[PDB]
Symmetry: D4
Amino acid sequence: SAPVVGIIMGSQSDWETMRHADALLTELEIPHETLIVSAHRTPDRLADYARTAAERGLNVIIAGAGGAAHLPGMCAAWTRLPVLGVPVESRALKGMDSLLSIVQMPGGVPVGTLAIGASGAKNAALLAASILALYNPALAARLETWRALQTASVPNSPIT
Amino acid sequence: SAPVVGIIMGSQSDWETMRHADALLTELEIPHETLIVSAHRTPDRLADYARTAAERGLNVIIAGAGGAAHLPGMCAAWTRLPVLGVPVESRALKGMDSLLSIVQMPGGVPVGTLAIGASGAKNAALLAASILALYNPALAARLETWRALQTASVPNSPIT
Amino acid sequence: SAPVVGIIMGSQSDWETMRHADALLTELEIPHETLIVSAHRTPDRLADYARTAAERGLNVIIAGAGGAAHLPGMCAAWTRLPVLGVPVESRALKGMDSLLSIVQMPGGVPVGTLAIGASGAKNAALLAASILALYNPALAARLETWRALQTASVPNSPIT
Amino acid sequence: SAPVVGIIMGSQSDWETMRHADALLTELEIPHETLIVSAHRTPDRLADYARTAAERGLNVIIAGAGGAAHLPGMCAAWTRLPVLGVPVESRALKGMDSLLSIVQMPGGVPVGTLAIGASGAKNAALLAASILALYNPALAARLETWRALQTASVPNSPIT
Amino acid sequence: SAPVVGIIMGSQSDWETMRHADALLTELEIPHETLIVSAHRTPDRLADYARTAAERGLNVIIAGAGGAAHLPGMCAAWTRLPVLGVPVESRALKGMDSLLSIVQMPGGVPVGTLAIGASGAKNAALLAASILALYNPALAARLETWRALQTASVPNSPIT
Amino acid sequence: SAPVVGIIMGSQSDWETMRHADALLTELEIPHETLIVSAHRTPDRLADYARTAAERGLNVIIAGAGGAAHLPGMCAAWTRLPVLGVPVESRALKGMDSLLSIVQMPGGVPVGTLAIGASGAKNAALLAASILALYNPALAARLETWRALQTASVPNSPIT
Amino acid sequence: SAPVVGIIMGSQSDWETMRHADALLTELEIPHETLIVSAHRTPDRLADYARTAAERGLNVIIAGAGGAAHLPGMCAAWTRLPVLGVPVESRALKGMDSLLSIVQMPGGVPVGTLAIGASGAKNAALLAASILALYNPALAARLETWRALQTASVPNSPIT
Amino acid sequence: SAPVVGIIMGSQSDWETMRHADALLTELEIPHETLIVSAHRTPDRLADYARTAAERGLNVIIAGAGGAAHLPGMCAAWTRLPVLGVPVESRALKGMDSLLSIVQMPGGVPVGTLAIGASGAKNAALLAASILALYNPALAARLETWRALQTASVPNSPIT
Ligand SMILES: Nc1cncn1[C@@H]1O[C@H](COP(=O)(O)O)[C@@H](O)[C@H]1O
Ligand SMILES: Nc1cncn1[C@@H]1O[C@H](COP(=O)(O)O)[C@@H](O)[C@H]1O
Ligand SMILES: Nc1cncn1[C@@H]1O[C@H](COP(=O)(O)O)[C@@H](O)[C@H]1O
Ligand SMILES: Nc1cncn1[C@@H]1O[C@H](COP(=O)(O)O)[C@@H](O)[C@H]1O
């Protein structure tokens, strides 16, 4: 089935983080593609990917990178689609550089930014799901189930 | 004319920032409502607003607050809709508390976060528009026009 | 015996930190309950817990969470009881996000915030004790003993 | 009329902030004293103030200071009473030095810390009131009224 | 008279800072061009500017931007020329977002980064001059004179 | 021989850091005492230590602590002697809390602050030595030798 | 009348801060010299100033600079005398760059660092005085008087 | 062959980082020297190195250090050559101190600063290469090849 979400990441080293977005989309049965695209090492690959995303049928892009993390913002520069940004935890600055590089977009070109690291990757996929759910009733019910199970599954007290 | 986006903010002092989201939605002809909801002063008002948003026909919530900024995250706790968070600039810490208290959502409850301040409010509205544009071709055409005009309006050289 | 302190925490993963509050309360023989309550994954569980805390005989609530740590503040939103907040050390940002999310409450809804991590969990319990001690003479004497033993036990010089 | 809360601050320059704690205690009819005590300029005055607070009938101390803000922690060192700390905003570092030097107390000597600046001072007074309200029903009723009014006074929409 | 340095900046608001680079290059008689290029509003203009810089005879690019500052890094992605980045001071975060989003380039695509603000713009021009001075003896002599004058012009004592 | 430097530290856990000050003083044959003194757990022990330091023949105090690190400043509050402060690396905030708690002393009561961690402990001892050297010619020559050996011993190129 | 303290600063813009060190030394009758020395604009002037300070009869150097503040550390590199560093507040980063670039000296070359800004300058002078007071009884008596007056001059309550 | 790039570093402990610059220069066949030079422990060694660099035929200096990292800036103080600075990751502050110490140079004496850590060391060498490439066609072609291989080698999708 044709992908409706693109997951892109700046490097293989981001995969340990971005796999959490991939897994969540698969759990909810959201067809998606998962690609490496570097804003800096493959800038024309990025331009082409972002420019053609909509005509290819993508609805949402999830972009993850670390450091001077420009992949989400430059993707949003070329697509009208919603772009969600995952700050990957960097070694020295723990993703604060990633976070500021992604979230602080000037007015005109948005990136919806999620938490640093694996939680943000998971939430980027959930956010993409909640967007798709607006016009896909079956997916909306599966998302409702997912959220209900999350809530119901929280224990009442810690295990010691 | 029925609202499809809800803009909520923690206080009147947030309006100087959040008015930019309001203006952009009006510019793009996106029907919306604009409210004050305090996560800490009116927690039950928030619970009811967020719980009922989808059945009231809202598709996206834009939530803005500053300091220990819980409004977006708690909104997202109670709705299955996409929630976008605007960190309002705070006096002492310049919105860094706003930013971290909004963006660092743990796995399972996303908030799509935008830049600190007016830029973020503007971009929350643009991000909401790009979401709605996925299943509204007239709006998609208006957003394309808007993006194209932004691109065409950048000058080639500075004024000295 | 009926609990007079509630310890609540956002997740099982917080228990490694919050167990230090539990242990201290037990050492001082302060009856207490220890629960998982997520502001974001179980928001109605939190509303109910906080709303009914006083009528259930609780005097003080100790709430711990990490990241966008909204559990203490949203608990204080619904209870008139004093709420003490423990910032749990987060992976990337080392609890700075937890700290700012908890301590930077706007005027009107306070959270008494303790240090990031285990020391804060221990001190949240000691602070709760010092509050209860105001109207429980036996506990006040046990707290006096605890503080005296802490002081007396500090060695005069390091072991090499 | 005998004070049950002590407000102490490191300098006259702290009063612009700490006056908000004073006002709120008066509003709630909580008898209190308001003093300047410098941890570094009058360390013996501090030792004596804190040592004797409980026997003088104080139940809670609210301590405010900025920069390397030692006043709350050293107060807590010498009293068994609950000490609440207000980080006063500093010129260069905007109260981040105030905050960290107050909140990061090691295990065994708590300071319940509130927000940087006026909000924190207000909330220290509210937190002190919620503590006293535990064993003062008239005050508990006044605080409930106060909280309920805060909730009722939040508007539903912003003014443009 | 053909330009050997390109100064590019993300917006007119950057000119207050980047004008210092322009002035210093003129002072040292380094022919240059000064343009506005938005990484996010005119991404294809940027791609073309950077791709073609070397064949147009440019030797160094000085790029200035603020906030999530992608202009220097994306310029460097598309040119083999040395790119120098000037972090423009931002309103809320004082150029710390500018700084981290410029300097933290991952391995393989350098941006030589200068100080936040006017100093950085001035120093980008001086750094560009020292680069050009390597294979331009007349310019090398002008730069030596400039450095020597800077050294000679420092007073020996302050004015009171 | 009577100690002329006092090393004091807030806890046994600081010794891993403060031993570097001890070792340096011993290397230079500077008689000294090494003690645990907690500002918060043993405040009267600190008052007495600092108050009597000068009459006991101490010339310089080196004080190390972590977190809300008030030991150096409160020591300086009671002694006219120069106090040097060593920020101990804390677990969560890596000694930034220690650093700000120590260095940001208001005017009137100084603490000469050294680097976070072991380097600062070593340098506190070297700084104390350079102070004593002003009026002890033999020690001054041993310090000169120490500095000369440091300089001479730096290799010219790295070992691979 | 021969100077025993040298105050050096990187620029005239530093004088607004460093004048407080000058004033305090004059108040305590400590003969001193006050100079501008730029670590980066006059590196050989600095080398010569620092190399020769001890033979010229200086006992302590107070060095102030802002931004990438190398003046104190490089001074300490070339003198065996105690060097005290004053972080001058910087425009964008509020002296945090000044602070870290002064205090974080690696092992072997100390700089005793004081607070950001005017407080630090004042305290550098007081710290220098406490050093000199060790072997100057008349000065020791003046400093005691000064400290005692500071203590006596703290008011007991704020002015409203 | 005579070196045209000097790599200098403050300590053997920096070599784990700076070896990445060495390796890159060797890969591109750029003759270079690799030296330890401490700004603080060997200040005259630094003065001499920087002063004579140009007359020795060096074109670019790459300087790496950590903490109060003054090596790059003080090198630039004495040479007219372009100096590139590599912030070495420090233990406590993760190279934020290194970064600010290097990048925040006031106007007049530039250091082109690269990312914290190994990526910055690699990029300092690439930046030096892109400078040399301006007047060495063979090297320019080898750099073009290097950049082309980097781009071409990025995989299209992650390995799981
Ligand atoms: N910002 C960016 C642009 N292209 C890649 N990156 C990022 O560079 C970091 C390191 O990549 P690598 O490990 O391949 O050097 C990764 O987090 C990746 O997102
Ligand atoms: N803020 C919040 C709300 N609900 C849970 N959390 C926090 O999310 C973090 C991670 O939870 P988990 O490990 O279950 O993902 C924990 O520190 C927990 O307090
Ligand atoms: N600030 C302070 C006052 N008394 C002790 N500390 C500090 O508390 C930290 C932790 O002490 P402990 O490990 O005993 O809890 C140590 O760095 C010690 O200097
Ligand atoms: N800033 C500086 C001046 N001279 C050496 N350093 C730095 O000091 C740190 C620690 O050096 P060492 O390990 O030898 O103590 C290294 O990062 C080195 O660049």
